[PDB]
Amino acid sequence: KNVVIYADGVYDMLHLGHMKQLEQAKKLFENTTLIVGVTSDNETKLFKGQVVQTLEERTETLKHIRWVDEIISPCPWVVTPEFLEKYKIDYVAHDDDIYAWLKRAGKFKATQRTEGVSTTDLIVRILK
Amino acid sequence: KNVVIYADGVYDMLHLGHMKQLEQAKKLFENTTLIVGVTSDNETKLFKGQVVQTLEERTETLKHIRWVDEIISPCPWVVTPEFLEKYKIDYVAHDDDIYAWLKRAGKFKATQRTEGVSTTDLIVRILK
Numbered sequence: 001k002n003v004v005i006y007a008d009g010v011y012d013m014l015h016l017g018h019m020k021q022l023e024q025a026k027k028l029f030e031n032t033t034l035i036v037g038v039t040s041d042n043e044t045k046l047f048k049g050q051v052v053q054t055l056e057e058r059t060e061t062l063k064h065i066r067w068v069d070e071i072i073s074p075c076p077w078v079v080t081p082e083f084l085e086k087y088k089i090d091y092v093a094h095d096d097d098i099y100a101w102l103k104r105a106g107k108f109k110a111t112q113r114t115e116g117v118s119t120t121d122l123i124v125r126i127l128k
Numbered sequence: 129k130n131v132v133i134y135a136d137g138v139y140d141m142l143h144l145g146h147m148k149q150l151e152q153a154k155k156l157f158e159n160t161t162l163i164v165g166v167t168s169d170n171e172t173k174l175f176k177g178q179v180v181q182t183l184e185e186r187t188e189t190l191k192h193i194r195w196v197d198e199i200i201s202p203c204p205w206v207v208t209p210e211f212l213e214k215y216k217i218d219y220v221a222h223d224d225d226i227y228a229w230l231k232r233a234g235k236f237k238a239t240q241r242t243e244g245v246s247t248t249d250l251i252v253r254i255l256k
């Protein structure tokens with residue numbers, strides 16, 4: 001009955017947008033375990049760009065979020081079939097092609113972003 | 129057995145500091161209900177100063193925090209004996225004199241801040 005959901009991300013300067021996506025992932029089925037993967041500082045820099053918070057900071061903040069049952073920190077940059085078997089993951093939840101193989105397997109669940117609520121957008125707000 | 133704890137605050141741009149205080153309040157006893165009071169936009173401005181986020185935004189973010197069982201939004205600026213009876217509150221938890229009457233009654237539990245982890249401190253970090 002219990003369904004294992006995996007959501008990965010940088011989770012830099014966690015904001016309501018991230019929180020809503022985690023909520024959505026958690027609530028995909030009636031009984032879930034939400035595992036959250038937090039990306040390493042080096043791979044995030046190499047593959048994405050600037051990260052403000054350290055892995056420790058990003059991970060520690062996620063611990064306080066209601067929807068998070070387990071954290072993998074650091075997580076792999078790229079999800080593999082071996083990773084899913086290792087952690088007994090039933091679905092991967094992410095914003096929506098590197099996820100084609102997951103969709104082909106029936107193991108992909110889309111979740112939605114929220115614009116405007118960003119931590120950086122809040123500073124853009126204040127300046128006046 | 130279940131102990132009702134009340135923590136109030138502005139909770140503007142919620143950060144690890146706030147989250148740790150809420151955790152501390154929640155864990156004061158083995159079985160607790162943590163009620164969190166979120167201050168109104170006008171009273172925060174009048175009595176404290178600038179608030180970046182609206183009451184709705186501050187309240188919505190707190191909903192996602194593991195330790196929060198109930199929210200009173202807006203909450204009164206000043207705690208009263210009548211308020212404690214109304215919500216069946218056993219202890220008030222806050223950083224540590226407007227709380228003298230609570231300490232005299234045995235209804236005050238100190239919780240600690242964390243400096244450096246602030247949302248604004250993180251912007252102070254990045255600029256370089």
Ligand SMILES: C[N+](C)(C)CCOP(=O)(O)O
Pocket residue numbers: 008009010011039076077078095
């Ligand atoms: C590649 N990755 C999925 C592990 C990290 C990027 O995820 P995200 O922060 O864009 O949601």
Ligand SMILES: C[N+](C)(C)CCOP(=O)(O)O
Pocket residue numbers: 136137138139167204205206223
């Ligand atoms: C007066 N008050 C306690 C309701 C709001 C101020 O609380 P805080 O944000 O300084 O912890």
